[PDB]
């Protein structure tokens, strides 16, 4: 039995994402294109800011800038909530709480138009400090690698997630953005609640030489992990 949700995935699917922010009154828009393919977990993109340049770090907006494109093995895919609401999708929600500073609260809806992965997001962030390490631009364009832990939300036929990325500030220190997620159906079909399971995720953040626009290259790897169902009998 493969879901519909998961034959949706199982080539190469083009990606879209359109962001708009305001971060403490500073309004800007993302735009960003690539693919995904879901079988090896492997998403290629790149972003642009459209305004002009963008008011915060790249780095922080990584997150929130399509988990239905991770790789579940065999013997977990039937905890994958993201790819069972497909077509129709899901709402993604975070809170991101950057410690000593702001707080980015963001609302999106990842679904097909037609055979393209869109993920349309809202942004605002509020609370910033002017110059602190977001809105005076000092952390580093580093890789970014983390676990984020998936639980189920039975009362939102969902999910709810958490985790913490660690943005490395230009002089050593570290930033931390403490991640709050949940996640629910656009429409109304089977609902998948996961055993408590995780997505182990990789990052890596790149400029292409011939782009004068603000802009990031992202190739990004993403497997969940945590489950074994018996799988370990079997060796
Ligand atoms: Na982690
Ligand atoms: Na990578």
């Given at each position: 039995?493969?879901?519909?949700?998961?034959?949706?995935?199982?080539?190469?699917?083009?990606?879209?994402?359109?962001?708009?922010?305001?971060?403490?009154?500073?309004?800007?828009?993302?735009?960003?294109?690539?693919?995904?393919?879901?079988?090896?977990?492997?998403?290629?993109?790149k972003?642009?800011?459209?305004?002009?340049?963008?008011?915060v770090?790249?780095?922080?907006?990584?997150?929130?800038?399509?988990?239905?494109?991770?790789?579940?093995?065999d013997?977990?895919?039937?905890?994958?909530?993201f790819?069972?609401?497909?077509?129709?999708g899901?709402?993604?929600?975070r809170?991101?709480?950057?410690?000593?500073?702001?707080?980015?609260?963001?609302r999106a809806?990842?679904?097909?138009?037609?055979?393209?992965?869109?993920?349309?997001?809202?942004?605002?962030?509020?609370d910033?400090?002017?110059?602190?390490?977001?809105?005076?631009?000092?952390?580093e364009?580093?890789?970014?690698?983390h676990?984020?832990?998936?639980?189920?939300d039975?009362?939102?036929?969902?999910?709810?997630?958490?985790?913490?990325?660690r943005?490395?500030?230009?002089?050593?220190?570290?930033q931390?953005?403490?991640?709050?997620?949940?996640?629910?159906?656009?429409?109304?079909?089977?609902?998948?609640?996961?055993?408590?399971?995780?997505?182990?995720?990789?990052?890596?953040l790149?400029?292409?030489?011939?782009?004068?626009?603000?802009?990031?290259?992202?190739?990004?790897?993403?497997?969940?992990?945590?489950?074994?169902?018996?799988?370990?009998?079997?060796?």
């Amino acid at each position: 039995m493969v879901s519909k949700g998961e034959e949706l995935f199982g080539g190469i699917v083009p990606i879209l994402v359109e962001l708009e922010g305001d971060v403490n009154g500073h309004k800007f828009s993302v735009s960003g294109e690539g693919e995904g393919d879901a079988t090896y977990g492997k998403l290629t993109l790149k972003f642009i800011c459209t305004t002009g340049k963008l008011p915060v770090p790249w780095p922080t907006l990584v997150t929130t800038l399509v988990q239905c494109f991770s790789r579940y093995p065999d013997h977990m895919k039937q905890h994958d909530f993201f790819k069972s609401v497909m077509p129709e999708g899901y709402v993604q929600e975070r809170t991101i709480f950057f410690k000593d500073d702001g707080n980015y609260k963001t609302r999106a809806e990842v679904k097909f138009e037609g055979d393209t992965l869109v993920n349309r997001i809202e942004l605002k962030g509020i609370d910033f400090k002017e110059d602190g390490n977001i809105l005076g631009h000092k952390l580093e364009y580093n890789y970014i690698s983390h676990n984020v832990y998936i639980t189920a939300d039975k009362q939102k036929n969902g999910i709810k997630a958490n985790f913490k990325i660690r943005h490395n500030i230009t002089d050593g220190s570290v930033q931390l953005a403490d991640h709050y997620q949940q996640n629910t159906p656009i429409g109304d079909g089977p609902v998948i609640l996961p055993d408590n399971h995780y997505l182990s995720t990789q990052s890596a953040l790149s400029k292409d030489p011939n782009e004068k626009r603000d802009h990031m290259v992202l190739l990004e790897f993403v497997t969940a992990a945590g489950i074994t169902h018996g799988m370990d009998e079997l060796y």
